[PDB]
Curated annotation (Swiss-Prot):
Keywords: Acetylation, ATP-binding, Cell cycle, Cell division, Cytoplasm, Cytoskeleton, DNA damage, DNA repair, Endosome, Kinase, Magnesium, Meiosis, Metal-binding, Mitosis, Nucleotide-binding, Nucleus, Phosphoprotein, S-nitrosylation, Serine/threonine-protein kinase, Transferase. It holds the Pfam family Pkinase. Gene3D superfamilies: Phosphorylase Kinase, domain 1 (3.30.200.20), Transferase(Phosphotransferase) domain 1 (1.10.510.10). The active site is at residue 118. It is found in: Cytoplasm, Cytoskeleton, Microtubule organizing center, Centrosome; Nucleus, Cajal body; Cytoplasm; Endosome. The record marks 9, 79-80, 157 as: CDK7 binding. This is Cyclin-dependent kinase 2. It comes from Homo sapiens. CDD domains: STKc_CDK2_3 (cd07860).
Length: 287
């Protein structure tokens, strides 16, 4: 740690404090994150999981019972960008570019059997060139997803897939597609899709929009650990009501990212081939 000079505190992560710092040896500016042998091996494997849409893990430093992760530094997150773009909305070509790039990062990680598990706007970092990158990939498997952060802050449920809420502990890469579909809808509408404040509120918000799932749409759902036959039965809403003014190609893609059955849910690779991306470009964001 003596090789890093702290510049400023940049945030409070799920696992520990995040600082902007300067590497005295290389001169580079980095994001330094303060955080068991199984975790060291898993985190070490992430140093080789390199892609332009994945925030680069520069180093892992384990010293005197503390773990430090050194990441490439990016100047803002999507949560702050969406808040700053609230009055006007993020332009559709930029939403499309961001979704396209995030799907590329997921397709790469998923091809290596690495899941994120906790995607959220605060974990999506942008630069002034038009890129967006996935932060903290693989950290949920190495350290778990807690109910509360190290500062006691509630970990958001808003982007959590229904199979996790229903008690599947052996979930798939589909959980990340669900989270990204929720984020896509939020960029379009400027409001969170499913802002639950408890596990049951999260589930019931999903059910009130997509319909209460049953054996027809999701074979095996009624046998899941936390499924209860007493769940209320709500009808499914049309996506034309849920995400206006998104065009039919965008609504088709979103609906496939939000399928209940993880086996039916579109993969990141198949999503990249969707006609919604026919006219994709890479605009420069207004920052």
């Amino acid at each position: 740690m003596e090789n890093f000079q702290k510049v400023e505190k940049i945030g409070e992560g799920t696992y520990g404090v995040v600082y902007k710092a300067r590497n005295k040896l290389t001169g580079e500016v980095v994001a330094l994150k303060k955080i068991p042998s199984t975790a060291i091996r898993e985190i070490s494997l992430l140093k080789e999981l390199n892609h332009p849409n994945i925030v680069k893990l520069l180093d892992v430093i384990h010293t005197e019972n503390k773990l430090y992760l050194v990441f490439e530094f990016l100047h803002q997150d999507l949560k702050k960008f969406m808040d700053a773009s609230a009055l006007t909305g993020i332009p559709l070509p930029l939403i499309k570019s961001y979704l396209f790039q995030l799907l590329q990062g997921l397709a790469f990680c998923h091809s290596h059997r690495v899941l994120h598990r906790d995607l959220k706007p605060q974990n999506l970092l942008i630069n002034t060139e038009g890129a967006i990158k996935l932060a903290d990939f693989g950290l949920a498997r190495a350290f778990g997803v807690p109910v509360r952060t190290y500062t006691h802050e509630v970990v958001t449920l808003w982007y959590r897939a229904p199979e996790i809420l229903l008690g599947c502990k052996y979930y798939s890469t589909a959980v990340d597609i669900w989270s990204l579909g929720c984020i896509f809808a939020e960029m379009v509408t400027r409001r969170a899709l499913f802002p639950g404040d408890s596990e049951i509120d999260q589930l019931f918000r999903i059910f009130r929009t997509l319909g209460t799932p049953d054996e027809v749409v999701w074979p095996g759902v009624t046998s899941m650990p936390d499924y209860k036959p007493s769940f209320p039965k709500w009808a499914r809403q049309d996506f034309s009501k849920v995400v206006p003014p998104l065009d039919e190609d965008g609504r088709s893609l979103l609906s496939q990212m939000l399928h209940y059955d993880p086996n039916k849910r579109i993969s990141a690779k198949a999503a990249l081939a969707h006609p919604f991306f026919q006219d994709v470009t890479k605009p420069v964001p207004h920052l």
